Design a protein around this ligand. Structure first.
Ligand SMILES: *CCC(=O)N(c1ccc(O[C@@H]2CC[C@@H](NC(=O)N[C@@H]3CCS(=O)(=O)C3)C2)c(Cl)c1)[C@@H](C)c1ccc(Cl)cc1
Length: 147
């Protein structure tokens, strides 16, 4: 469901921005996802250090355009798997870091619009596959939770 995925995307951005929501904290699924997607994010950032400077993420519309282009490329072969889904979260982490630095008239609520378009992409493009492969709780978590 959209709301569940939106919460994962918002939790991940709040984790990257070092502002986890005060309170009882993220779910077990969200905690597992943060760990595994951050490992991906850091390696992507290291490998792509040169080209990450080729954009200036001045607005949320710039971030959405980059997101659409990168994800159309990422899924061009039609293969959906958990690795690619994790990479979506790693990529929104890179985008939010660039927006924090580069957004004109920064808006501390920006991570909520990025979470929305991330959830929209995941739902509409990978949602069926996710359900058929166990959902987050019987698919993703079972595969990636600590040994
Ligand atoms: C030098 C690249 C470049 O100019 N840009 C770019 C392109 C793609 C990016 O990220 C995608 C998402 C992470 C990485 N994909 C994978 O690692 N996928 C493997 C194979 C499938 S898997 O098993 O799931 C893992 C490539 C980035 Cl971060 C950057 C630009 C288009 C660019 C530059 C800066 C920003 Cl902020 C956005 C885009």
């Amino acid at each position: 469901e959209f709301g569940y995925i939106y919460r994962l995307a918002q939790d991940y951005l709040q984790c990257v921005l070092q502002i986890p929501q005060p309170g009882s904290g993220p779910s077990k699924t969200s905690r597992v996802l943060q760990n595994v997607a951050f490992s991906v994010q850091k390696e992507v950032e290291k490998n792509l250090k040169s080209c990450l400077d080729n954009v200036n993420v001045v607005s949320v519309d710039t971030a959405r355009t980059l997101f659409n282009q990168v994800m159309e490329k990422e899924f061009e072969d039609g293969i959906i798997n958990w690795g690619r889904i994790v990479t979506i979260f790693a990529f929104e982490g890179i985008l939010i870091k660039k927006l924090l630095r580069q957004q004109i008239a920064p808006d501390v609520d920006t991570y909520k619009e990025i979470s929305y378009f991330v959830a929209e992409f995941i739902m509409n493009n990978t949602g069926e596959w996710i359900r058929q492969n166990g959902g987050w709780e019987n698919g993703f978590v079972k595969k990636f939770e600590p040994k």
